[PDB]
Amino acid sequence: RRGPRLKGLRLELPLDSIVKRVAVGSPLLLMSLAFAQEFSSGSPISCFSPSNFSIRQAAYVDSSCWDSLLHHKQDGPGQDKMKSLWPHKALPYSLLALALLMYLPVLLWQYAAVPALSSDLLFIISELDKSYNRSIRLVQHMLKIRQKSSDPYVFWNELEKARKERYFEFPLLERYLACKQRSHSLVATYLLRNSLLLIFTSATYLYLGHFHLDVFFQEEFSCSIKTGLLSDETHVPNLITCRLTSLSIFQIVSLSSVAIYTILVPVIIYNLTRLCRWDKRLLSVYEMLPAFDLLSRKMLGCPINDLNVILLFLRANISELISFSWLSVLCVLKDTTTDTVVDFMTLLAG
Amino acid sequence: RRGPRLKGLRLELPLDSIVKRVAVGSPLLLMSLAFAQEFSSGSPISCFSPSNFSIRQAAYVDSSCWDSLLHHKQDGPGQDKMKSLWPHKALPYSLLALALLMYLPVLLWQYAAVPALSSDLLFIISELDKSYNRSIRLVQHMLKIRQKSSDPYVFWNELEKARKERYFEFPLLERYLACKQRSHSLVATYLLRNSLLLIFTSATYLYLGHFHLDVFFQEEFSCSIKTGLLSDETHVPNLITCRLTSLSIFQIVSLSSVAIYTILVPVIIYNLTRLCRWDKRLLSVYEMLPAFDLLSRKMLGCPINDLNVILLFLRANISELISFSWLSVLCVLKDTTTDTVVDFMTLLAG
Amino acid sequence: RRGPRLKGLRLELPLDSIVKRVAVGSPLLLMSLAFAQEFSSGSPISCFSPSNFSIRQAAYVDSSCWDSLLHHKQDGPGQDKMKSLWPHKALPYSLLALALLMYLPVLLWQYAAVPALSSDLLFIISELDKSYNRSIRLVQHMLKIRQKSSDPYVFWNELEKARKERYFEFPLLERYLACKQRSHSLVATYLLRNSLLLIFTSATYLYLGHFHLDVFFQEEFSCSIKTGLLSDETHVPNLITCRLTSLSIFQIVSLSSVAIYTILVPVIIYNLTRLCRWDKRLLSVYEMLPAFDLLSRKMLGCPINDLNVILLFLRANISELISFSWLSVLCVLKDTTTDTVVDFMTLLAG
Amino acid sequence: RRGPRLKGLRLELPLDSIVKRVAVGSPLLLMSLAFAQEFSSGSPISCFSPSNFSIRQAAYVDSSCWDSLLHHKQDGPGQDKMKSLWPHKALPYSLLALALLMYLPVLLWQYAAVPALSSDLLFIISELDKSYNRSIRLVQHMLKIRQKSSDPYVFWNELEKARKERYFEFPLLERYLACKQRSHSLVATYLLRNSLLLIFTSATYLYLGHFHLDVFFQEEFSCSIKTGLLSDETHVPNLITCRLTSLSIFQIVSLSSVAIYTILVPVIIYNLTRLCRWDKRLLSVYEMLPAFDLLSRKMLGCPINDLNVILLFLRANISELISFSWLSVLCVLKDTTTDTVVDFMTLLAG
Amino acid sequence: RRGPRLKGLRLELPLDSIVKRVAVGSPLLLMSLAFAQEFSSGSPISCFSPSNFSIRQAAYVDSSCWDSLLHHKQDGPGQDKMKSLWPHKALPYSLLALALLMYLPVLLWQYAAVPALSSDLLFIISELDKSYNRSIRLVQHMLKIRQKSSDPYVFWNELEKARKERYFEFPLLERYLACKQRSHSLVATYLLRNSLLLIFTSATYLYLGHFHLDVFFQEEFSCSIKTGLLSDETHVPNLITCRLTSLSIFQIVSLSSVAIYTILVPVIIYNLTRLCRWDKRLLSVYEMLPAFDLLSRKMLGCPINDLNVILLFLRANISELISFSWLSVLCVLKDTTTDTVVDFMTLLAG
């Protein structure tokens, strides 16, 4: 029971998982599409060499014109003195670099803030289960006392007496939360991961703006082979002119990546903003019970605190641990009420 | 028992599962067929270049004419000044976009309304099994009292006394259903998912009506290569005329998608209408027992309510849980009768 | 025990399963063969273009003549003014449509009549095992009474007394069968599924008689390319004449499908006939036992009733459940008899 | 223990399993070899067309001459007016038909005689284990009386008394075997399956004798393309003459299939003959045991009875069930004897 | 414990398994290599046709010359009037035939001598474990008697008395072994399997000596195409002369197979000779314990008896069953001793 609970513990908020998967898979899918196009077309570019050229000579011209992009510029009939067509060649490599960059912050978070968070979460839930049991066991005596005397004054007095009984409030958790309220490691790692994601998105925007808009269309370009030693060969032409077939795929890939990351920006902004605000209905729900009372009194402090991230993970987990299904219904009963404690105790016993 | 039961709980209905599968598989199947045709034909189009052109020059003409669809229009000998043949090139990408759009509402529903619904279903069934056990436990005393006195007046009086005994009616369920009847999150998500499906179907209709009917046949088109820098090349022709071989596949894909989504429309309309009416024979069947009676008196309210969706999921689930295997036969016995309670109690005990 | 039993419950039948498998596998296998032939031949058709045509122009002619089947009708040199050769191109698509049509009634039956039948079978067998145990429990007292007095008059009197004892006859089963005898959902679904199978078989017959017999042989056909915008090109011929290589595969596929469905027709007719008659030796076998006696008195009514389908499934299942291996031997003993009950009781106890 | 025994029960004998496997594997393996040759050669036939013909025209001639086998006869330079070369084209299809035909009787046997045989076998073995236990339980008293009195007269008298005690002889088994001696379903299915196998073997012999010997060698054949519309084409030759490369593979396949089925004939003859004779040493072994004595006295009748098949499967199964390893040694002891019963009882107890 | 022992029983010896694997896999590996060479070379042979021949005509010549090996001889420039080059074509088929022939005796042995041997082995080991336990249980009394009186005369007298006690010597095993001494089925099957292996090895030697040495080198051969109907074709040459590329692979395959089977011959001879001699140190080791004494004194007759095979399998199995690790150490103690019995008894007790 315990071990399976530890394995099922969540250390990555459900919403951020989709962002991780998208930001790490989209460049990979685009790169796979680029490779598929490259291997389907046979040749990345095709050139219009004279009829005299044999098949081998034409293949040599194609290869030398396609491989001379990273090295020398090539100019089409709509451009200035020079235009750089290199991004056509360095597209899959840039996609690999972008995928690695996007995966890097995930690795940073996992290696830097998985173990402490796991330990804190497991310890807190282990304490909280028995804390809830101990809080519940007094409800029977509370109900008997209420039945004996119906006035509310005695009820409030006995509630105060139970609170002061010192049989609970777990001074361990009080000190632990007091210490955590000053810790900043988890918030630091979270904010750093989000900021890295945003910085890399801006970097991709800059890359696709500086190096892809200039040659976005660039239908054809006039290559040359005489730059090498074979300048005394009159057989070859001077300015063999040709084009590149994967231009449409390049344009698509670029636009698709831009759109995907524009979509992803606001999600990351919301994820970062989640820390600025303390986790409000649930707070009023859990304030009543002494077990959750201790951790609900810390909202006076600044929102940016390690406990805040721990609070987010507790809210994410407790939704499925099992301990949440009861107090929610109990507080729904309280809200509906103009008896409730007796019904809650009966349900818990059942 | 509880574990496997909560694993086996269904949260997507049986009928909507087929629609979800179809609306995401059909576009993928059509895309796979398009890619298979592309890689089987070797080239997407073939052009009738002069005999002087070598193999490499002919391949260059083919590639430049096939890649100049998204960029420039091409006109056949039956059209107006201009006709756009770009939908031929952007078919698989549009199919991918449509598949993602159709899959989006499923993800929205699963991320937005799976956990609350799961918790509500689990709590309701867990309480309902105990409610049924407690209710059936009193049939023995009912039988003894009925045997002692045969008149129906005493039977009715004792039935009222049992109802007022207060040993059941579970004030938890009463207040839970009262709260649910005002909630609108589940109905909102359901209606939003259905409306998204309808809107995306209409969008596909518009896309295939605007950008496929104009060039539905468009056998051939007249391409040109002189638009580039090689406008001084007298060797090449001026208006190389050629065609595209995947026209039949394009026409099929379009018609097939239109037919599939026309088929799917009415199913989604029925799914949306399901909420407009409360789930009648089963209602009369389950009204008798006190356990199901409590949720059977909420029919007065507006049909649109969170409880209605939960009612649908309970009806879908109880049909296989096991709890329904008895009351149906008991109410069949009641219908047959001009003793029945005794037979039902004996069957339950057995 | 109960779990594995309900997993092993059969809800299709041993015979109709083979028809279900064949009616879907045959079109799929034929389509796979057609695709294999298409990808092995490389070119679905080959045309006899002049020697002047280069390789690219010849490939263009092949593609344009093969793609102009579904759009225009081509004329062979043995025919009337015009003949339609489109079924050659639309063969695998028609096979896919036929496979989907064949699979549709199976899905209808599974989604429409699997759950009610499963529940009815489960309840009936669960009650019948206990009924058999209770019935056999009295054989000991019957044996003692028979041993005490050897005359047959007292034996018959005690048999009547046991029948009237009211310790069995399970009024639940009586009313359940009475209600079922009026139900018609299961018979309706069964008849609808079989009728859909027959209608689709007739539709395939019509399709292969209208659109395959006319062009069954159609060795060659005279194609044309000047219909496009190369009508002023004197280089091309006027009426390039050519043939299609997969003609034999087409002929085979057609004949094979016709034969397979002709074989399948009588099986479905027999499946429909199975409902018109109640299942006779087994009835005389099971009449004696009181538990089986109740369900054996309902044949006075029309054979077309919901209970009839449930009776068929009971006969199909009980053959392997275990509850049948004994009564068969007991009734074999009864037939062999000119003691038997004592031997049966001893065997059951052992 | 029981369930695993039921699963491990053999229902197809060990010898006929090899014939079943071979009669289906051989045609499938030959078909796979034919397809491998077809896809390795690239062209099923190659033709010697003039040098003027381009590559496309030569491929057209090849395809039209290879596809005109099933349609029109082709004559080689050693034949009469006409010879039919169709069997070259319809070889893999004929192999598929033969494989399906050979698989059909197996399916008939499995669907028609598996369940009754399984039920009879399981019932008989379940009764026989208890019968053997009861029979051996009396060996202790037999040994005691034999020790008390050494004369053989008292031994025989006590043997007769034990036989008449009526504590065994299981009247159930007697009546069951008496009923089975008249049943003919199992022998009918067995003989029908064997006769179907023999008939299909003879059919293959006829097919390979009528349609393969005539054109067994048929090196080359003179094709023609002018039969179509292009009879005014002076360019093409009149009687293009060519050959087929897979002739050796065809010859092999034919000879191999003939040899395999000639090998299989005698095995099936022996399988059929197995029923004509009752299974003798084992009968003398099992006659002594009272449990096996009952079925031993049933060979007075005709060997062709249902029990004969049941006897064959009992002999096949008991060899591994466990109930055979002891009585064989006991009867070996009896044969060696000029004490043995005491040793057998001690071994059984141990 | 028992069942796993039955599954782990060895029924094929450790040495003959390697011979089986080699003799069944070597031809398969050589066939795979031949097929790989065939599919890597593209054309099994290449011919030097004139320059006038187009590509299609050259391919036709290649195919017609390669396919005319099994039909007509081809003569090279070093040979007599005729030489047969067919073995080049039938090499993989001959390898398949050889593999099937080598696998046949294995199947014969497994189908004909696995069940009886398995039953005998399991029965013998089951009896022998109890025999060993019963024999060792008397060592305690033997030790007590030896301690009471130290003289060897009383020790020998008590040993004889224990041997005559009749509490062991298991007349079951005595009679079983006496019967087995006359059985010959197992030795017959073993000798037949070995003789089949030797005969098939000799057959391969004959096949490779008659049909491979004559044309072992045979670099080239002069083919002809005019033998058909194109004898009036002046365009074709008369005696197109060409070679075959897989000659080296053929030579290798042949030499490798010869070497492998020459290696395998002596191993099979040793396996056959194994039966001629009874298995000697172990015989003296087991001559002591009464459990193994019974089977040790059954060696007086001819070594070729059924028990001999049973003895071989017992020796092979007991090495790992567990029942041998003790008596070996006890007899080592006996050999080392000039005390040994006392030490062995103390070790057993410990």
Ligand SMILES: *[C@@H]1O[C@H](CO)[C@@H](O)[C@H](O)[C@H]1NC(C)=O
């Ligand atoms: C074509 O070839 C000739 C001779 O090889 C050469 O003189 C001429 O320059 C070539 N054409 C071009 C455009 O270079």
Ligand SMILES: *[C@@H]1O[C@H](CO)[C@@H](O)[C@H](O)[C@H]1NC(C)=O
């Ligand atoms: C064929 O080639 C010649 C010279 O290479 C050129 O003048 C002519 O225009 C070409 N014909 C076409 C139709 O392009």
Ligand SMILES: *[C@@H]1O[C@H](CO)[C@@H](O)[C@H](O)[C@H]1NC(C)=O
């Ligand atoms: C053959 O080619 C020449 C020149 O390319 C052309 O004039 C003639 O029409 C062609 N033959 C046919 C049958 O079209």
Ligand SMILES: *[C@@H]1O[C@H](CO)[C@@H](O)[C@H](O)[C@H]1NC(C)=O
């Ligand atoms: C070769 O081609 C010429 C012209 O294309 C034709 O007249 C002649 O008949 C052809 N040769 C044969 C054998 O058909």
Ligand SMILES: *[C@@H]1O[C@H](CO)[C@@H](O)[C@H](O)[C@H]1NC(C)=O
């Ligand atoms: C070359 O071809 C011509 C005609 O195409 C033919 O007459 C001659 O015999 C061929 N050469 C040889 C060596 O056969």
